[PDB]
């Protein structure tokens, strides 16, 4: 399993905030860990809710959990990591594993958050990529949230 | 909010032992309720001491009290539960609230401690499977401690 | 300057189409190489036009050229690659350099376009990231364009 440390935890909190699952606005009984794309909540943590939500006549998504994990990616990782449920710890595990695969861990650990965000933009829709126009602006908000979660930026 | 019963009290004692705040070795004048991460003690219970013992980004911690509650979580819960101080009763309240949120209360009440421990590993670093670089007690030692605190296991 | 080959050329054409600079509808006198974000054209190729265009209150951008390169990245790469102008050749050079830095060149050369697109999504806003809700469908329309530009997919 990818180890959790203060920098990584702060990154996961920034991410939960960015994705809108744990931002003090969206309703939740457990820090966004029970949020289904669209805003509904689930209570059974034995598996991904797998509820297909139509966000509009031309947009569907199965994102669920604190990091809005798609069901197809959940299946891949649950098998790969040997996870027995979709509990908060399992959700953190998958997110960290995806961050690991993108080579972002060293960046997070050392405080190069702007780079970590860019590297992870291909996984999470709320994160901007560096070539996009609004990056500098969005990264400031993200960096601020990262800092208040206790992370240290370089 | 969350009322205390024998099973829950036994869980909190097991937790204090696990976290190293109340284990008969760590110094304390009040059963671990005055312990700051690192081992120093505080005497003013009107608020979380809000101290760290390292500036190392990965290792940084503000844990304080019997259950080593981080200051950022303290602020969230203080507001949410309407707590006026960081007294032992307030500390117990926050811990029980976090346990309630991870869906572990029914598990504790019925004696399914191994499951409750797993669900709570996402909150406390000493609980087996937590995934930090810290020492994690074996489930067996935890269950033994839970039983000597008067809890009944199924 | 990174070398151009048929696979790479086809990727740059797919990209110009995806970004809307060279798609048969947007006006241009030079295959999108003269397009400023928003749709205006420039004629002086000695430097990036450097116009900050407001697309809406929340979205501003300085993208210009066939691949909609932001001015700040233009300055970085101009210096790094020793470019003396913002001519079509220079624009291609920077795009290829960015693709090289994302490790997508081998993917493009071998025909693994879906992977290359995902790796490059952090640079270009029109490209989809793999964790995105509709990756497979958007990738399909891009692959079609890549193939008609003469590229071979695996």
UniProtKB/Swiss-Prot annotation, chains A, B, C:
Catalytic activity: Endolytic cleavage of the (1->4)-beta-glycosidic linkage between N-acetylmuramic acid (MurNAc) and N-acetylglucosamine (GlcNAc) residues in peptidoglycan with concomitant formation of a 1,6-anhydrobond in the MurNAc residue
Gene Ontology annotations for the cellular component aspect, listed alphabetically: host cell cytoplasm
Free-text activity regulation comment from the record: Inactivated by zinc.
pH and activity: Optimum pH is 6.6.
GO molecular function: lysozyme activity; peptidoglycan lytic transglycosylase activity
Chief localisation class: host cell
BP GO terms, sorted: defense response to bacterium; peptidoglycan catabolic process; viral release from host cell by cytolysis
Subcellular location per the Swiss-Prot or TrEMBL entry: Host cytoplasm
UniProt entry keywords in alphabetical sequence: Antimicrobial, Bacteriolytic enzyme, Cytolysis, Host cell lysis by virus, Host cytoplasm, Lyase, Viral release from host cell
Class of this enzyme: lyase
Catalytic site positions: 19
Effect of residue 31 to N: No effect on lytic activity
Function: Endolysin with transglycosylase activity that degrades host peptidoglycans and participates with the holin and spanin proteins in the sequential events which lead to the programmed host cell lysis releasing the mature viral particles. Once the holin has permeabilized the host cell membrane, the endolysin can reach the periplasm and break down the peptidoglycan layer.
Oligomer and partners: Monomer.
Family: Belongs to the glycosyl hydrolase 24 family.
HAMAP family (alphabetical): ENDOLYSIN_LAMBDA
Protein name from the UniProt record: Endolysin
């Amino acid at each position: 399993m990818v180890e959790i440390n203060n920098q990584r935890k702060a990154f996961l909190d920034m991410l939960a905030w960015s994705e809108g699952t744990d931002n003090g606005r969206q309703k939740t009984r457990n820090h966004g860990y029970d949020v289904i794309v669209g805003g509904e909540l689930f209570t059974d943590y034995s598996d991904h809710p797998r509820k297909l939500v139509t966000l509009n006549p031309k947009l569907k998504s199965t994102g669920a959990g604190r990091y809005q994990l798609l069901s197809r990616w959940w299946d891949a990782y649950r098998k790969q990591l040997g996870l027995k449920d979709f509990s908060p710890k399992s959700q953190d595990a998958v997110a960290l594993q995806q961050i690991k695969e993108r080579g972002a861990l060293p960046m997070i650990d050392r405080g190069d958050i702007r780079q970590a965000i860019d590297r992870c933009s291909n996984i999470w829709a709320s994160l901007p990529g560096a070539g996009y126009g609004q990056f500098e602006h969005k990264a400031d908000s993200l960096i601020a949230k990262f800092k208040e979660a206790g992370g240290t930026v370089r």
